[PDB]
Amino acid sequence: MREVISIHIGQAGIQVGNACWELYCLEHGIQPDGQMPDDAFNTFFSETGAGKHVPRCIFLDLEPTVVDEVRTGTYRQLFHPEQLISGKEDAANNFARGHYTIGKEIVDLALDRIRKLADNCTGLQGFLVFNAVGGGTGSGLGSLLLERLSVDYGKKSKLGFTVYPSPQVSTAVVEPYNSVLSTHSLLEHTDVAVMLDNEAIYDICRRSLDIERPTYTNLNRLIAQVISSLTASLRFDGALNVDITEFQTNLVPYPRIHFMLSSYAPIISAEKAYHEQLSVAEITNAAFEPASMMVKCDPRHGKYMACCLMYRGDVVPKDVNASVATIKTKRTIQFVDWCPTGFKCGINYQPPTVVPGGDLAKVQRAVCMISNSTAIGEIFSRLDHKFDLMYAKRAFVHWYVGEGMEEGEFSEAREDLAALEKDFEEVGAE
């Protein structure tokens, strides 16, 4: 009844989808074979007559390796074989390759399977698109799929949990290029975009989980916990329910401004757990700590516009109200003048389930804070000069041209990002 269709595009999307679906299977008791030994799974799983539960997900990639690892691993009997869609040639970190030449047939088949999945959903809260801003497959094919979804499905809420390049550390070279292109693409298609940075999540793991060697599996586990906290209000009942439609209506002040900082709390290992109270006020403060942001962007530079809090576990409205009052009275946290409330609290009675073999401990309470704040303009400012530093010399431009782009596409994307900067400045200022 409250079905949400999950799309995982690119290596990053698929690798966070592995963690997400492991988390969902653990949360709903679904064994990796597919079936579990009510109807809270309907948001993410559709049950067949035999009793087997198949997720409403779609793994899209132009490279066979990442999807084939899923086909070979433990969750080989869980996902639908045709739902796993694999290309033949990788996009090679080329937005043009993933958006104009290789991505066409792949996204056509993706729309076909998405249509089949939506036909199996009585309701449809929306789409959860998990991709990687900064890679040809994630950026190009993800943008193409988002455009097609906006064309056909229309008003369905598409929540894009994008992973943007980190400020200083990075793994690709043309990452600013395809990041700017994908940002121009998804500024006008996704309904709520959530920013995530590998540097920020590495910092979170190093400080809070005390992992000196964090890895992609740990990052994806944290992201999966964030998304599970987001969707907990759809699957488990609780006081102050939040809906997928309600996230926008409480978070997106203007259509252009829909990019979101995310912070989960508490992030504590098994060793350091049960050593502090971890009460509601403390975990709310931890969530509002700038160091707990999953984006390398200091909120102190900007001003919060909206803050949606998702509480999980033993949380009471007295406690959430007191915590939010303390946060408001805190002088470090600064809100815009035109949003006096700026807070959307939603509680859920289901504590976050702990993945065995993960570093997170079993905490009876959790807070997931998703904030629309004008500080996020800083990361766009960083990418805006990282892109144009190369684009002044037109470095790697011939690569993008070879697969059917023009200098005009780069110019328009960069102009749109500058306009987004101007819009952020305008909304932040009085």
């Binding site: 080329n94 793994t171 690709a172 011939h398």
Partner: protein
């Protein structure tokens, strides 16, 4: 399922190809008779990248062996892994090119090139999807350089979009093997600039330096040099063949390495190269691997990176490692040596991670540097070419094969323009 067609050209190219195919057969658990004997499913995951299955369990390399004299591939067949190759893929002439690029490209290469392209097309059509062709050969030799460049031009004409990867053994700076090395290298670089999408420069003297200083071998035969080259050629494509935490194909490396089409010449290095004495004493850590990667002695090209500036640099790591450690290490390297890195590129490092290390190694890493230091290599070769061309020494050998004098001038002009590109982007300032 992204197939790579290997081509070996000339004596040096054939020996390097034999070593490389023996290394790959070891890595995929293929015995010299072709049967799989690895006892690991990871070996057969992506064996199609390099091999085709026979009627039985036999696996035949997607390799094409080239020569104008049969002796070199007679030795190749007599080698330990000479029987894996399909005998139909051995293409030989009868009179070898006398270290004459003209003979290997115009007179004697013309007859054999039809058969070479037939074999290449037959191997390429069997491919489900074709990543591209990798050609191992040596600049400064007749059949190798001439035939390899001719085949590269033909394959570029037939398959424009497919990748072209080249492993060229550029003549060594300090000691020259043959006299006509500057002529052959100058004529071959002109073809490789226009045709080859991706090129790796190797120097025998640099390999001697690395095998005598790091491996500490005192009498290294050509087998050791071919072994190091084969390790590099395996590590460059290990991401295609094994699952990776952050995988990256040849096209991805080319996109992240090549800023402008003509600047596709790279110097490569492979880590960790450890002496037998210090094998136990050395610590396999990501910082240690990165430190050995960025050392100038680790480069297999004669030019040292210190003189030039790194335009780009890819690092394909192998092993169960922290992506945080890898990214932090190379970011720290960039910050420390920012003088040696180009300013107008915010990030000059392309990190790739594969989950499967080479056999016996806990961790490893191949480094591919696009740096303006190769400018001095080209400059030296041009200094030799001009000195010989001014007095037309040995020029009659090329002239009597039906090559115009103007072709030498055109090749040297192109090579000097490439040198100008490298220097201009070395001293190019942002804004």
């Amino acid at each position: 399922m992204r197939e790579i067609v290997h081509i070996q050209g000339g004596q040096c190219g054939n020996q390097i190809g034999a070593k490389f195919w023996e290394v790959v057969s070891d890595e995929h658990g293929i015995d010299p008779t072709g049967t799989y004997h690895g006892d690991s499913d990871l070996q057969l995951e992506r064996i199609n990248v390099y091999f085709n299955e026979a009627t039985g369990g036999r696996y035949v390399p997607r390799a094409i062996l080239m020569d104008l004299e049969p002796g070199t591939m007679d030795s190749v067949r007599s080698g330990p892994y000479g029987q894996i190759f399909r005998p139909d893929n051995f293409v030989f002439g009868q009179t070898g090119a006398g270290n004459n690029w003209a003979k290997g490209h115009y007179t004697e290469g013309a007859e054999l090139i039809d058969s070479v392209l037939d074999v290449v097309r037959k191997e390429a059509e069997s491919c489900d999807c074709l990543q591209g062709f990798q050609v191992c050969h040596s600049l400064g030799g007749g059949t190798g350089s001439g035939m390899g460049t001719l085949l590269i031009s033909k394959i570029r004409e037939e398959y424009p979009d497919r990748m072209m990867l080249t492993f060229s053994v550029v003549p060594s700076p300090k000691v020259s093997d043959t006299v006509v090395e500057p002529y052959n290298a100058t004529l071959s670089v002109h073809q490789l600039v226009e045709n080859a999408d991706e090129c790796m420069v190797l120097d025998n003297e640099a390999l001697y330096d690395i095998c005598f200083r790091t491996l500490k071998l005192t009498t290294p035969t050509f087998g050791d040099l071919n072994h190091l080259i084969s390790a590099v050629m395996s590590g460059i494509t290990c991401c295609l063949r094994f699952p990776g935490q952050l995988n990256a194909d040849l096209r991805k490396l080319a996109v992240n390495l090549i800023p402008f089409p003509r600047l596709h010449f790279f110097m490569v290095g492979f880590t960790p190269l450890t002496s037998r004495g210090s094998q136990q004493y050395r610590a396999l850590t990501v910082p240690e691997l990165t430190q050995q990667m960025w050392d100038a002695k680790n480069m297999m090209c004669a030019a040292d990176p210190r003189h030039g500036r790194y335009l780009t640099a890819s690092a394909l790591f192998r092993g169960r490692m922290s992506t945080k450690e890898v990214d932090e290490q190379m970011l720290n390297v960039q910050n420390k040596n920012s003088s040696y890195f180009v300013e107008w590129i915010p990030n000059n490092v392309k990190s790739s991670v594969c989950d499967i290390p080479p056999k016996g190694l806990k961790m490893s890493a191949t480094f591919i540097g696009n740096s303006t230091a190769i400018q001095e290599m080209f400059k030296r070769v041009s200094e030799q070419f001009t000195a010989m061309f001014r007095r037309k020494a040995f020029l009659h050998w090329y002239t009597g094969e039906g090559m115009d004098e103007m072709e030498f001038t055109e090749a040297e002009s192109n090579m000097n323009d490439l040198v100008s590109e490298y220097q201009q982007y070395q001293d190019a300032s942002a804004e």
